mmCIF file of C-alpha atoms and ligand atoms in Angstrom:
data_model
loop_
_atom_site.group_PDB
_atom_site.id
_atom_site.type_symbol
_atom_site.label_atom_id
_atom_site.label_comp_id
_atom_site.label_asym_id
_atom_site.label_seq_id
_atom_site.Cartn_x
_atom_site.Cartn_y
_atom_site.Cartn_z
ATOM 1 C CA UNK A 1 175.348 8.931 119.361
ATOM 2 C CA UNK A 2 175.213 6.013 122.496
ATOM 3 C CA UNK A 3 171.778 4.229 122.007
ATOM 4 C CA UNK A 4 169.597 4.943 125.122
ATOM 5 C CA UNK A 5 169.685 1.247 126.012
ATOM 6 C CA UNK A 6 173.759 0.770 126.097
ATOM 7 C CA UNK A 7 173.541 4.585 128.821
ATOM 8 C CA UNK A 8 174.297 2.151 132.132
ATOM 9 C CA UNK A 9 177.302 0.430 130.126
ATOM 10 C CA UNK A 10 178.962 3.761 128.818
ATOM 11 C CA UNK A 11 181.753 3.037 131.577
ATOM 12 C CA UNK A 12 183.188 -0.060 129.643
ATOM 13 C CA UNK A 13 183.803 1.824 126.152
ATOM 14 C CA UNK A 14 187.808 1.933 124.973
ATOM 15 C CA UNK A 15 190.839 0.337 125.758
ATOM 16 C CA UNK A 16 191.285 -2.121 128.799
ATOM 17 C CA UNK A 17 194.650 -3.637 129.682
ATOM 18 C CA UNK A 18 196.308 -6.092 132.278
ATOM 19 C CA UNK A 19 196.833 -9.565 133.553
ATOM 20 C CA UNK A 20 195.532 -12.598 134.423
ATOM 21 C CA UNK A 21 195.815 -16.365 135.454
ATOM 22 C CA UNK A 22 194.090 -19.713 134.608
ATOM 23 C CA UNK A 23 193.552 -22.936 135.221
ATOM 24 C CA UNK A 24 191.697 -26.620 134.965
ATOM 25 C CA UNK A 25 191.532 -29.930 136.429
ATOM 26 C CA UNK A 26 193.045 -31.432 132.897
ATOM 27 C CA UNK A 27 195.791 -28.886 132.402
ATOM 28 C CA UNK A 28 198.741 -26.954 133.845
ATOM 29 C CA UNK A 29 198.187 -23.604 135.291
ATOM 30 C CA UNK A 30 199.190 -20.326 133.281
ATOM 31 C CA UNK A 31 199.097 -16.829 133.513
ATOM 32 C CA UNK A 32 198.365 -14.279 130.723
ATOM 33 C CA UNK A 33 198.541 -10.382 129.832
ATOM 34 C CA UNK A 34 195.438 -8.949 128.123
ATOM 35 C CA UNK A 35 193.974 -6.761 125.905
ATOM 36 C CA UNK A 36 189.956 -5.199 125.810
ATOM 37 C CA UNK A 37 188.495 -3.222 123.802
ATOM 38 C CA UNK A 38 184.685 -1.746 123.665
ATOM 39 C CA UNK A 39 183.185 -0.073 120.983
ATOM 40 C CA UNK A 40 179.805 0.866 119.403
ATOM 41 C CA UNK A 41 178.347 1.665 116.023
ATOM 42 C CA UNK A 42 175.331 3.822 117.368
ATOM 43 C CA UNK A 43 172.927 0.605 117.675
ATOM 44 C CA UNK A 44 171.913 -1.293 121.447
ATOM 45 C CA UNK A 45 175.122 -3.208 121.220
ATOM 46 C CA UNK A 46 178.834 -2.852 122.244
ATOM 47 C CA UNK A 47 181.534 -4.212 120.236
ATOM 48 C CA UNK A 48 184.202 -6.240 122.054
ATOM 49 C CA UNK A 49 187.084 -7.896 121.085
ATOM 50 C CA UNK A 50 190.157 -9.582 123.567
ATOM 51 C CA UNK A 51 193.867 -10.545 122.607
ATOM 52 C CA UNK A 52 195.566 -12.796 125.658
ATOM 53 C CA UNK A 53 199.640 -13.547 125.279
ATOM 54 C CA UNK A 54 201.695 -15.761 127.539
ATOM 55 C CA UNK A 55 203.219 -13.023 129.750
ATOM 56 C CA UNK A 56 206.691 -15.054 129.182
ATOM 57 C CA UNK A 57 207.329 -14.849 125.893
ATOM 58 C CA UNK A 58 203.940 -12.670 124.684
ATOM 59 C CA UNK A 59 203.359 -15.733 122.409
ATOM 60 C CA UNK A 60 199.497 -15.027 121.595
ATOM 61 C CA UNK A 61 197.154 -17.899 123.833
ATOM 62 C CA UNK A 62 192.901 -17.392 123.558
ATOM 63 C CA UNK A 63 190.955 -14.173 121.871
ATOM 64 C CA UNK A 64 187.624 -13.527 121.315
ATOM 65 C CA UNK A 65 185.373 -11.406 119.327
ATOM 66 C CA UNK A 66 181.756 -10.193 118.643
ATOM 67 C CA UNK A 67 179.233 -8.238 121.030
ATOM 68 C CA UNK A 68 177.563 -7.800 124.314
ATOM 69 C CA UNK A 69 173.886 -6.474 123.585
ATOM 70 C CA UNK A 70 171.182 -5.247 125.956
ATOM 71 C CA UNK A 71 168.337 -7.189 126.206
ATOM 72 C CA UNK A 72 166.071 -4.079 127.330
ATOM 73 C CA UNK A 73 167.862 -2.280 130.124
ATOM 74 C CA UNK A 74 169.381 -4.394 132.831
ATOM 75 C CA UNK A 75 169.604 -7.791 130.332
ATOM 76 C CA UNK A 76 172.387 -8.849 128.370
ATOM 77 C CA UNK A 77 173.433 -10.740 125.591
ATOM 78 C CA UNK A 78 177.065 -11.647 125.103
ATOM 79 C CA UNK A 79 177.532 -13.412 121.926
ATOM 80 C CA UNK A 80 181.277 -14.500 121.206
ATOM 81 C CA UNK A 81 183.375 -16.408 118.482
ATOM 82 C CA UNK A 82 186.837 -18.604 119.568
ATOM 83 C CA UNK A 83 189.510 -19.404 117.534
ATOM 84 C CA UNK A 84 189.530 -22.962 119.203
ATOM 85 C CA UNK A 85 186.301 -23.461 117.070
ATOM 86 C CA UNK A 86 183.290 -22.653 119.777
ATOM 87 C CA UNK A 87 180.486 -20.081 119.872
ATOM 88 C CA UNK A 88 179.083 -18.530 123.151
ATOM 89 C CA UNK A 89 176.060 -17.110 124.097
ATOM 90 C CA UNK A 90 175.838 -16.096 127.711
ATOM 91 C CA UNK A 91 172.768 -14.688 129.243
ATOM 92 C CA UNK A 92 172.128 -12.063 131.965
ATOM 93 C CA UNK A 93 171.303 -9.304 133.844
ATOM 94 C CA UNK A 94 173.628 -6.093 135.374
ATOM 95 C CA UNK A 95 173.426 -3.478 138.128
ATOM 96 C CA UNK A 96 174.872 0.032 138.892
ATOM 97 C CA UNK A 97 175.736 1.136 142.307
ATOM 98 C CA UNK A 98 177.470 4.470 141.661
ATOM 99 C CA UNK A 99 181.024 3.998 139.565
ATOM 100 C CA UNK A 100 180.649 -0.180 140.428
ATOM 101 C CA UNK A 101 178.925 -2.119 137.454
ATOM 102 C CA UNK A 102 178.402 -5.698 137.907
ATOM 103 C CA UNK A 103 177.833 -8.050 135.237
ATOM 104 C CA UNK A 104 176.283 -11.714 135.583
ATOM 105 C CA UNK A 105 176.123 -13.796 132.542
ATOM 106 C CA UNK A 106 175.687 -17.656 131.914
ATOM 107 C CA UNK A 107 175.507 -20.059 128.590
ATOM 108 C CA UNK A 108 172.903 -22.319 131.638
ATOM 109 C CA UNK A 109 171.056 -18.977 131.451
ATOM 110 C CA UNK A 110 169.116 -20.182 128.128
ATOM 111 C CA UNK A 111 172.572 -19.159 126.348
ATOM 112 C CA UNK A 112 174.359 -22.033 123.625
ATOM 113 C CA UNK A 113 177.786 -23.159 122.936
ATOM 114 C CA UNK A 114 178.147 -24.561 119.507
ATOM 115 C CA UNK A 115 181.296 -26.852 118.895
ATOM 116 C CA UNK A 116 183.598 -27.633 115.621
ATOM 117 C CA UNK A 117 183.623 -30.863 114.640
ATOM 118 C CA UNK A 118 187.625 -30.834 116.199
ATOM 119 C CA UNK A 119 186.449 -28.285 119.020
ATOM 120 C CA UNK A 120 187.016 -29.429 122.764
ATOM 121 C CA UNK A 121 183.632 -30.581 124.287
ATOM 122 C CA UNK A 122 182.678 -27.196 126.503
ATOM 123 C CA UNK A 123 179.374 -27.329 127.690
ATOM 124 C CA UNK A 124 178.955 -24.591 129.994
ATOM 125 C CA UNK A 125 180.404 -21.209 130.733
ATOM 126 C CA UNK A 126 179.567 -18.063 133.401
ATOM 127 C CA UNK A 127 181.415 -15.036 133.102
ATOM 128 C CA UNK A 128 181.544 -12.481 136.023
ATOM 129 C CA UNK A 129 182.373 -8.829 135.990
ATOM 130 C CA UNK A 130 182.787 -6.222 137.732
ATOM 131 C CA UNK A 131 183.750 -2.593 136.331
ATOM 132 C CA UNK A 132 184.707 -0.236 139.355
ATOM 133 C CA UNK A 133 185.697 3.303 138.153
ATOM 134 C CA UNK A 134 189.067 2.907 135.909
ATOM 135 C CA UNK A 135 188.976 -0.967 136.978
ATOM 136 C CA UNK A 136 187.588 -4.371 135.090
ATOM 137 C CA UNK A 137 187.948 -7.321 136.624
ATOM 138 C CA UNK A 138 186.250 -10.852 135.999
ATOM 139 C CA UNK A 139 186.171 -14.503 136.503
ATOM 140 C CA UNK A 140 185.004 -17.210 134.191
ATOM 141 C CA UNK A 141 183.912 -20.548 135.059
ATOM 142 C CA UNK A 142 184.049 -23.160 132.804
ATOM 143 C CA UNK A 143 182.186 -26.840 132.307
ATOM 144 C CA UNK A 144 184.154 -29.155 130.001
ATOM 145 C CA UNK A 145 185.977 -31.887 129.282
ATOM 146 C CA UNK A 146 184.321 -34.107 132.134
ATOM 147 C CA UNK A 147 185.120 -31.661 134.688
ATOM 148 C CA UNK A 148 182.009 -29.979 136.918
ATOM 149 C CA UNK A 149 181.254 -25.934 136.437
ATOM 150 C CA UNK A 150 184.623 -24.590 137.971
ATOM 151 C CA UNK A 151 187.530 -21.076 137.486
ATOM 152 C CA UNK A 152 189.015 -21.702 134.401
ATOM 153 C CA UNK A 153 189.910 -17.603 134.213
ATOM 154 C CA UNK A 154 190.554 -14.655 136.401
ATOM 155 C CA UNK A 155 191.653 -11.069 135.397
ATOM 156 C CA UNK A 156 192.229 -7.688 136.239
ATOM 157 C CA UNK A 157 192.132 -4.684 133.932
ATOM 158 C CA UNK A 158 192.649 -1.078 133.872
ATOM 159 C CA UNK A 159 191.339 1.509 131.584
ATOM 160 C CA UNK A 160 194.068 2.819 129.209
ATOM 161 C CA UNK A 161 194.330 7.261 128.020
HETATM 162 C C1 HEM B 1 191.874 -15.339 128.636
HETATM 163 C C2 HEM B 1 191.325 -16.322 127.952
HETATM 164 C C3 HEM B 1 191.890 -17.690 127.962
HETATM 165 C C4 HEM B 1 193.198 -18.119 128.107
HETATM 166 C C5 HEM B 1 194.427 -17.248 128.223
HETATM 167 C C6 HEM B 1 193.174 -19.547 128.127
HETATM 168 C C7 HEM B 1 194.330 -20.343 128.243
HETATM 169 C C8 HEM B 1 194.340 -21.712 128.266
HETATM 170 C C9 HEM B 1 195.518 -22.503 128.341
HETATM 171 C C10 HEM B 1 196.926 -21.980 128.390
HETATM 172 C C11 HEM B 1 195.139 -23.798 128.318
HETATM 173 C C12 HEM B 1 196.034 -25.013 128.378
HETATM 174 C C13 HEM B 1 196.833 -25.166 127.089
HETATM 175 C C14 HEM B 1 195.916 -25.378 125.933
HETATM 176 O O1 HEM B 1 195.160 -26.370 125.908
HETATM 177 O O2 HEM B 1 195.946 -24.579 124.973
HETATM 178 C C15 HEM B 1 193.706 -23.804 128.210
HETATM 179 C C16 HEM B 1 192.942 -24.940 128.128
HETATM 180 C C17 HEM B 1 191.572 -24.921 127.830
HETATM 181 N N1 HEM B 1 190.791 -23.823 127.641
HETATM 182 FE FE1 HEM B 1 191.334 -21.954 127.861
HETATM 183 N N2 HEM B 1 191.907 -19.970 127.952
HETATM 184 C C18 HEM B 1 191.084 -18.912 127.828
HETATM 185 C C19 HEM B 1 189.725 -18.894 127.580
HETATM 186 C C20 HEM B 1 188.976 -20.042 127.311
HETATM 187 C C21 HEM B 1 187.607 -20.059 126.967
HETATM 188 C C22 HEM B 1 186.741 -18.844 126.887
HETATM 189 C C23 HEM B 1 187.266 -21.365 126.729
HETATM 190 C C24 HEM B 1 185.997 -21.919 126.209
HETATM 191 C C25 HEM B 1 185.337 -21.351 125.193
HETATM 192 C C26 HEM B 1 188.420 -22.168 127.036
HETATM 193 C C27 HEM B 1 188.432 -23.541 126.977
HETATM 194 C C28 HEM B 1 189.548 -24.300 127.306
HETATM 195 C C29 HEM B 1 189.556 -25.769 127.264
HETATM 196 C C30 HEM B 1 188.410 -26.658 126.866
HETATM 197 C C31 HEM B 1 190.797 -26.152 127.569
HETATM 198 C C32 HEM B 1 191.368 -27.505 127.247
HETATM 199 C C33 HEM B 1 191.333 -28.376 128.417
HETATM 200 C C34 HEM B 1 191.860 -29.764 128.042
HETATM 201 O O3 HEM B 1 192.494 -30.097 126.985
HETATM 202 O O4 HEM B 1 191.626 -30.584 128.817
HETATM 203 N N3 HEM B 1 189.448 -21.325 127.388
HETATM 204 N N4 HEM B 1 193.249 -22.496 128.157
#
């Protein structure tokens, strides 16, 4: 059974797939295909877990894995592992207008970012999203590597059978 706290976020559950792009002051740009998927075990959390490839060669680029909890209805909790060696925590709140969820989470929030020792220095990161009917779409902002709060990521994704 869906725990009466995840009932607003029952649109993201299964299988989400598209395309993306990306940049930063200290890098080229790129672009990226991608792969989302949502689950639950029965408890006030959803499990997530992304695959990105290089939409070249499909050469795998960034994942991510672990869980977006709500924080009592209308607060959540996204709390992340990166193979680059950094942890997230984002912070923040959602709304429902019909079939359009939004999504507003922040590490500045009173999230954390924990670092490797041979991590890149990331210090900040605010995730956007938006899931309209059979649509999820996001941006990400990132503060690192002496550049201000700034895109780093943009995608769109559609719900797969
Ligand atoms: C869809 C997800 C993502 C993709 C496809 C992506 C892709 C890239 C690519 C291609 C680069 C440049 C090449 C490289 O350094 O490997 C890059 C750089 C970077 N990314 Fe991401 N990224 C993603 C998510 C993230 C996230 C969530 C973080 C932070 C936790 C992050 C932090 C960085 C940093 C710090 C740089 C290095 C900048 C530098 O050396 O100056 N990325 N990313």
């Amino acid at each position: 059974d869906l725990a009466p706290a995840l009932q607003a976020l029952s649109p993201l559950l299964g299988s989400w797939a598209g395309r993306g792009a990306g940049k930063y002051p200290t890098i080229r740009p790129f672009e990226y295909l991608e792969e989302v998927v949502f689950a639950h075990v029965g408890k006030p959390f959803l499990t997530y877990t992304q695959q990105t490839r290089a939409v070249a060669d499909g050469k795998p680029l960034h994942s991510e894995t672990g869980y977006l909890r709500v924080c009592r209805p209308g607060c959540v909790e996204l709390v992340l592992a990166h193979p680059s060696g950094i942890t997230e925590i984002e912070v923040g709140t959602y709304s429902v207008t019909g079939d359009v969820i939004e999504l507003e989470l922040s590490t500045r929030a009173d999230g954390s970012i924990g670092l490797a020792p041979t991590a890149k220095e990331v210090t900040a990161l605010d995730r956007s999203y938006r899931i309209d009917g059979d649509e999820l779409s996001y941006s990400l902002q990132m503060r690192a590597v002496g550049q201000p709060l700034q895109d780093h990521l943009a995608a769109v994704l559609h719900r797969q059978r």
